[PDB]
Amino acid sequence: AASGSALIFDEEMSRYKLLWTDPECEIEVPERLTVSYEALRTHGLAQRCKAVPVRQATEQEILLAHSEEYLEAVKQTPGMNVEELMAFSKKYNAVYFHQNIYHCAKLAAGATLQLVDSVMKREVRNGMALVRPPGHHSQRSAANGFCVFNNVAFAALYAKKNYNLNRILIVDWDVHHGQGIQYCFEEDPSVLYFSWHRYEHQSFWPNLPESDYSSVGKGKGSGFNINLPWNKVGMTNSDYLAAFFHVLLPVAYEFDPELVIVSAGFDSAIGDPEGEMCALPEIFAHLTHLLMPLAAGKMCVVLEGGYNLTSLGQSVCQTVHSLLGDPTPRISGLGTACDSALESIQNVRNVQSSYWSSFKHLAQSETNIVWPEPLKRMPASVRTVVVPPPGVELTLPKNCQHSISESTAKEVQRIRDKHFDLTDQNILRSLGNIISVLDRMMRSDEVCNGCVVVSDLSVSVQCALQHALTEPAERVLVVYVGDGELPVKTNDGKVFLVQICTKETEDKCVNRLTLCLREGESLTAGFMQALLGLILPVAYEFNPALVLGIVEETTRLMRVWGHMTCLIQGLARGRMLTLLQGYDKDLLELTVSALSGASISPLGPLRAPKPEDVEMMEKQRQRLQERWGLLRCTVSESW
Ligand SMILES: CN(CCCC(=O)NO)CCNC(=O)c1ccccc1
Ligand SMILES: [K+]
Ligand SMILES: [K+]
Ligand code: NA
Ligand SMILES: [Zn+2]
Secondary structure, eight states: OOOOEEEEOOGGGGSOOOOSOOTTTTTOOTHHHHHHHHHHHHTTOSTTSEEEOOOOOOHHHHTTTSOHHHHHHHTTGGGOOHHHHHHHHTTSBSOOOOTTHHHHHHHHHHHHHHHHHHHHTTSSSEEEEOOSSOOTTOBTTBOBTTBSSOHHHHHHHHHHHHHOOSOEEEEEOSSSOOHHHHHHHTTOTTEEEEEEEEOTTTTSTTOOGGGSTTOOOSGGGTTSEEEEEEOSSOOOHHHHHHHIIIIIHHHHHHHOOSEEEEEEOOTTBTTOTTTOOOBOTHHHHHHHHHHTTSGGGOEEEEEOOOOOHHHHHHHHHHHHHHHTTOOOOOOOSOOOOOHHHHHHHHHHHHHHTTTOTTTGGGTSTTTOOOOOOOOOOOOOSEEEEEEOSTTOOOOOOTTEEEOOOHHHHHHHHHHHHHHOOOOOTTHHHHHHHHHHHHHIIIIISSEEEEEEEESOHHHHHHHHHHHHHTSSOSOEEEEEESSSOOSOOOSSSSEEEEEEESSOOOOOOTTEEEEEOOOSTTHHHHHHHHIIIIIHHHHHHHOOSEEEEEEOOOOOSTTTHHHHHHHGGGSGGGOEEEEEESOOHHHHHHHHHHHTTOOOOOOOOOOOOOHHHHHHHHHHHHHHTTTOGGGOOSOOOOO
16 A cells, blocks of 8 residues: 655745735745745655655646636746736736746646645655645636636646546635635535635635635535635634534545545644634644545645745644654644634534535434744654554554563552452453553653553553553543443543443433444444544543543444544544454454554445434533533524
């Protein structure tokens, strides 16, 4: 399978700039490109990437999204002097031209097609193109908003034509609306376009009615355009993650795209003079990670905007870090989205209820400036540590490894004489392994996560949890697939327990989330809704120091454990410990693969979730959203 991350870049795209006074355009500078590449270099990230060279887009490739009359017109700008270039620029809105911009636009476009080819030929897992000019505002017959040609529109059309893809997702997390992309695929259901953008009730450029949440596409494309307008500035990490958990990801996983292309503008990060939002560069590490389980990880990131030269480099680094599979930074201080964001989320969910499974219940009323620096994200020396039953030899990826100390031995003796009596030296060995892997995870920073097969749950769980809390792990998220009770106290706020089980239990405290899913062909789509809309919002708000996965011997959800294992590594710097009760080489091989950063195989189509399951999930939201506001996807009613 594929490996590596492409970084397509070329200094030549910094060799055009604005040649006259124009405050509308003067933020779009060559240094945007040189600052981001140097930031990747400083942090050792450009060196870890497969460099792929740029090429020019050909004429036939430009004509996939643009008219001959507009190409012929742009093709004449290399011969223009400055007076003629200003006059040509004024025929369009918020855009300037340069003797060399036609040359660089073909390079930005060709660079994008290079990244599609490398990803679709499996020569790399994923990648990023650092390009100028941006593309997402550019239209069939017009330059607009610093954009000459629509790089990301090309990528989607090119990938349709030359790889016969039927389902491509475009995520535009730039702070501006990519109307050029919207127009190009408005009637196209094979390309799903999601955009969030500063809108402020249409007072913010480009001041377009069709950038509102009510633009869902046209004709056969109805439902495949999703606009999320931001109507106030100052949106934070919590707003962005609310948008992902309750709008984008539910549609994205149900759509099941065969390729993901990000219009990656970082004018949506704190410090940017255009966006005026407050999301930290670290959020982009997670926006990236949250989408990587789609399309077997085949993600093409294309640079759009981002104009604060400091926020810019930091955010490019967080994105590539995640593309390379480095551990995600912990996001603290998360909570409810602001009211304007909940209103926008509310509205787009309701208008899209006609078209998408996760929102379908919302339709029938039987249901209804300075900031701190990002800390270093080092890949752990060996990512994953596996402890199969003694004697069971397995073939592991290059970043996995098998397992005891003298200190670990005395600790197990100490634990045994105090709390457990217990003589089985096999159980006593799992306890010795649990301690040692945790010590390597929590203290060394040389190991990231791990999986240990165990015999008895009640002793190994209790031992793993208690030992983790003194590592110290201020907070532990526990995810348990199984029935019955675990030696897990959720009374003091140090521990949150997610329990996927079969028998509907009593809702206890607000530190438990219990999901009893009706068995059948529904279990997979039901589980993925709960994961994106319930498990991840709480977990992200809880911000644990360690994740403890636990699976009972009692297969039925072999198909979703990989996605959860992948997505839950957004928490706790990827530090997860999975206890598997009983040997099952299929589940253990899947756990290790996802844990080690391997590409996750797609889910494909699934029977829509059962109404009883959706009803069960919304009862959990109502019960928990007052404590865990990141669960909110409506505005709260005031007293
Ligand atoms: C800059 N240009 C389009 C940006 C292209 C882009 O970044 N696309 O992704 C015009 C819109 N910007 C503003 O109206 C503005 C003025 C003052 C303060 C904050 C905002
Ligand atoms: K956008
Ligand atoms: K579309
Ligand atoms: Na102008
Ligand atoms: Zn922008």
